[PDB]
Design a protein around this ligand. Structure first.
Ligand code: GLU
Ligand code: GLU
Ligand code: GLU
Ligand code: GLU
Lengths: 415, 414, 415, 414
């Protein structure tokens, strides 16, 4: 052995994660993840020891403005602080000119991530929502007064007061049957009473119509929600905001491309304020979760499709991949080990362990059941929950009437 | 000029804007006069130092009557206190008399701006809206006629008369209960009466279904409708006062205008009470936003559009352009600089840099861009104020209902 | 002297029009219009003899790139067959370099033009349209059958047929009461009759709801028509095609300006086939009038304002002016007439005689001005006409029942 | 001294187009398109002389079985008919090892294409649809319970036998007459009975209002049917058939892909009985359009998005595409032409000129703006089919109703 090769790597799940008790372990053993396995396979096949090292400045890095200095992991490769890079370093021309890459071993595209919109489980009494509290309260008050006036008018000295059935209790019973439009078994005969009947009928006719119309409009508006799709709406949408990782090559791609859609996006991202960019993936996704709908995030599809299956399961992909790129193992210019590394990559590809490792690492952590897949878009049908409440009132009424009849029996058996 | 010039300029947000560090920036670097420094191409060719200098009077300037004294920009040019102006100033013959002008770099016109309309409170009797007056009337006459005809045939000589309930009072009662979809105990029991009952039921079914459908449509889609649209409306104006900027050449234009509609407008604005004119852009803006429903302000369309995208997005252009005029460079008569700089404007129009000059200010600040019907806030509950009218009718009817009973009681007292 | 200067002009209303008796008249009096009047003021100020001449090739003309031979009126002015031109020749830089122009005497803007949307005249029976013919037919049969079956089953012997009131006529009367949801005076007694009643009730309950829902939808859709406004979204609309005059200045404007919306307009004008372009203003207007709704036209606003006020009145302005331009008297390079002509124009402008002409040729010619004022038809409410039909049925029913009572009298009166 | 080369190409409609003067022109003039002007630009940079020819086999063509002797388009290179290929051909290692390939000029991947869905014939019982299934049972059980409780409370010794009319049969009849608003023959005389009578009315009012509202919502903004969410479903179902273009590189990709779903799909298509593979793009299109969506076709998405715009717009992409692959120029081993064109491809790749070509050959050909619903349909009346179901129920009810009377009469025949 000549020397242990110094390897640079940057923390991102599931490529690299801290071990449960890494502070107790050896420097190489401190880490666990996809890249730890791939590095051990390279170490086996190429036959040399290695030292895992975290990137000190913690970013992939790009050309510095107006200085042409390189920072990040790329910086560590060109200024000789380390010998080989095993990390999600993406291949693009502007860095190919100064560092060398192996053959690609994984494929990816750009993706968009948003919060899941809502969980709108209907309330036990949502059916009242069209009319609001005040109207119901005033309807209740009017109900009483109508019966009281009808009764008082109906019973007075004909100066023969017994010649009508409109007692107090019947004077209540009539208004309720009137209000539900169920008709009645009796009719008032006085001029005053006929006036009262007319006006209560008109009141009913207005109210029921207004309620039905408003409810129809309410359900119709919901149908046209039309959520954002295919990333095209973000060309014109402006209530939403979006941004990307800093110093990543997503940013270079957006500011360098000239396709009118992505040119418009870059114009937005360079003019939108305050700064939409974010310095780490973890707090970027935390920013999306906090914004609870208003801020979207752009990221590599591999990472997006890792996250949405994790425990919180509160976010999802939208749209397809916008382009295509690949990952590669990287090494300094003219490093003689680089071609052995390419051979190792080719052999591990042919042996299919690149499949083995991915099938190990992604699906086991996919503990979310992926329920509510969207394969049944409500079928427009009005579910029982939306009106459930109404049955409770009916059942309670019938339950009450039993007790009423029982006390009526106990009365009639002793009065 | 002494190989040096002080370029007359005015702070107007679409064309010249103060930099933040204005306490310490000085010279042209206090601003971003990209609207000028391309026309300074000939200033580059001649190499003379140019200072973008604030116009001393802070205004477009004017020419007095009688004395013909020239104010602000105009004064300082004609008095030789300044030498060249690249200010956003209107081409007009009254100024061509004493100064000369380049080819205009862009064209614009008179525009009119009002406070953006907003939904008002519902009327107490707004529950009537879906059917309009005529139908609400005709229903009544139909009801009367139907009751009378039901009465008549129901009291044909039975062979003894009055062998049925159907008196005129009872006939009105029956027809009223039948319209409202309520339990009516008595029955025609006879061919002509049954015929009358049928059609009346059909009629009431159709009316009710129409009303509910139309209201449902009404509550889904809203349109505020602007109250005015044209200069003709401004000639038929009820209360909304209007006037141009003071010292603005549009005012002189109105004084000059001979066409009968504009002459009537001018004579009104002359005969309107004082403080009908305003002296500054900010004053007009503040007056318009203060004028919830009382005043309207006239300004150039380019400023109107430049404001419309600012915050708050609560003002709007209405109507078309009233005329057309150019904006251009102005200079004292016969200046050795004013002649060749016209070549700059020409060749820059050929280069088409005018498009960049526009975009950099009107479109880079698009900000408050397109809003449309895509998604809406929840319609929310129907408020109590929107149907309140109905309750008053009910309580009024009940309150009335007692009096008839009391008078009946007193009537039968002897 | 002056050798009878020749003036070129192109026929276009209202600038120049044929005299109705031009078949036999001679001289400049053979014409009428704005321009032939204005020629008299030029002759007044210059004091020369002149002749009107019709443009042979009938178009204003353009560079005709790749051959670079001018044509039209401009052709006649540059190749020396025309001494001076007085016509709606607009001033543009590509012309000023070949020919001189005077000071502008009138101002113009470009405008869009469209057909009126035809008014939705109500029908005498428009109220039936929600429910389609076949259902209206079949309801009658269902009614008849139900009534007959109810009668037959009601009056079959219970083991005695006098025990129920459900005679044939009463059986016909029950069902009509039931359909309109207006209750009834009597109820079927037997099990079979109760079954029939329940069935008919369910049927009517479905029908009435379906009718109301459909009608509400039908009205709602009408509201959101949202017709083309400001006409710039013709850059986004594609169902409606639009043309432009050939060899006119408008045809140059869309190639020569380079604002993005006009770029895509010009791209459309390039690609659309059959060609949107047209040879003469009259037949372009004819194209718009016949190809109602789906076709549109671009023209100078002065000409549009002339057209839309004429008696056919079937077309209108839309949107504002796009830019600003003017017309001037024109003359060859170095012609001595040019400056005298400019002085004449200046004098007539200051003397306001330009208006003294214009007023005669537009304000008197307009004879259509009907616009909604004071109140508006379109606002919200249903017209009487929309439900007119219903009142006729009611009136006819009441009118019919009189004759029934009269024949009832005629029967009994000789018993 | 002089030298020329022969080129292979294929008439793929977005990439190469037959010029109308197809009778007698040369291949360097017969054709236009993305491949044609790409080749012209390449020859502009590299300077070499060439002649265009169609691939003589006219197809991609399959590998020779068990020998892999190359197809026409590759053989014309390997067997010296041509020296350079510029065609929509997939980059793959099974080809790269035999011939060299340029840097890819585009990145693309497989997608499904299916027939655009259309309105189906309405179901005979579609009148049920708005109120959902479970509710209908609850209504029935509530009706029964209400009738029983009414009867019991009506008859549990209200003080006794014969004191009231409310038999159990009559109680059920009352319950039914109260729901569907109609004539009420009798009424509860007692408090408990009136309580029972009350709430049922409120319940029926709510139910009816809800149904009629929702149906009206349904008939505006239809937005219906989505038969396939992704090829996942296509792997779960078996009714709709599918397959790739024959000899296509998709077939080789599936032949060796280790993903369980794709391996299942491969084993199925290999095991599929009828002719699932098609030889030409035209065949795949015609087969899909014919099959009314019962067959689905796999292709590279860059064709799919082009065909989508070629009217009629009756085909659509679904799913977010499958994978990523490159298209590039190819060159046989040892050919000197290889690197001097590869450097030109690199030049074009870095200069971005390809974006002009993409605009010229895809986006300038965009026509089908009906995607955005640029025109608004107009509603139509309900057909008899859309409600026909209820009539059968009515007639069946009457038919049943007649039989009871006869059996009753026969029962009372002794
Ligand atoms: N780490 C990626 C970028 C990741 C991202 O921006 O989402 C790169 O090397 O560019
Ligand atoms: N811009 C105008 C002032 C505003 C106005 O005329 O109303 C001018 O140059 O005088
Ligand atoms: N004669 C007009 C024609 C206007 C047009 O049709 O565009 C001109 O000078 O261009
Ligand atoms: N014809 C291309 C693509 C076919 C496919 O998509 O499988 C090739 O075989 O290279």
């Amino acid at each position: 052995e000549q020397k242990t090769v110094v390897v640079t790597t940057i923390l991102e799940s599931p490529y690299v994660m801290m071990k449960k008790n890494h502070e107790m372990l050896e420097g190489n053993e401190r880490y666990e993840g996809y890249c730890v396995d791939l590095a051990a396979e390279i170490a086996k096949h190429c036959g040399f020891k290695y030292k895992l090292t975290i990137v000190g400045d913690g970013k992939y890095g790009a050309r510095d403005a107006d200085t042409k200095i390189w920072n990040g992991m790329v910086g560590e490769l060109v200024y000789g602080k380390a010998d080989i890079a095993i990390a999600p370093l993406t291949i693009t021309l502007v860095r190919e000119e100064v560092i060398d890459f192996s053959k690609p071993f994984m494929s990816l595209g750009i993706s968009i991530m948003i919060k899941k919109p809502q969980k709108s489980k209907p309330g036990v009494f949502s059916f009242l929502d069209p009319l609001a509290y005040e109207i119901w309260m005033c309807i209740v008050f009017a109900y009483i007064g109508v019966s009281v006036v009808l009764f008082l008018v109906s019973r007075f000295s004909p100066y023969s007061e017994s010649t009508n059935e409109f007692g107090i209790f019947n004077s209540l019973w009539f208004s309720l049957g009137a209000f539900m439009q169920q008709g009645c078994d009796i009719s008032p005969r006085s001029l005053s009473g006929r006036i009262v009947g007319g006006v209560w009928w008109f009141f009913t006719l207005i109210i029921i119509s207004s309620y039905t119309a408003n409810l129809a409009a309410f359900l119709t508006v919901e149908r046209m929600v039309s959520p954002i799709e295919s990333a095209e709406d973000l060309s014109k949408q402006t209530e939403i905001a979006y941004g990307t990782l800093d110093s990543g090559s997503t940013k270079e791609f957006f500011r360098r491309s000239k396709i009118a859609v992505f040119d418009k996006m870059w114009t937005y991202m360079r003019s939108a304020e305050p700064s939409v960019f974010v310095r780490t993936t973890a707090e970027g996704v935390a920013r999306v979760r906090k914004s609870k709908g208003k801020y979207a995030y752009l990221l590599e599809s591999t990472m997006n499709e890792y996250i949405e299956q994790r425990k919180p399961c509160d976010t999802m992909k939208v749209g397809g991949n916008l382009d295509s790129k690949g990952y590669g193992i990287a090494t300094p210019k003219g490093s003689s080990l680089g071609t052995p590394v390419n051979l190792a990559v080719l052999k591990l590809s042919e042996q299919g362990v690149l499949d083995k490792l991915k099938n190990k690492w992604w699906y086991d952590k996919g503990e979310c059941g992926a329920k509510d897949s969207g394969s049944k878009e409500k079928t427009s049908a009005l579910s029982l929950s939306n009106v459930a409440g109404v049955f409770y009132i009916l059942v309670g009424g019938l339950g009450l009437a039993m007790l009423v009849a029982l006390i009526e029996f106990c009365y009639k058996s002793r009065a």
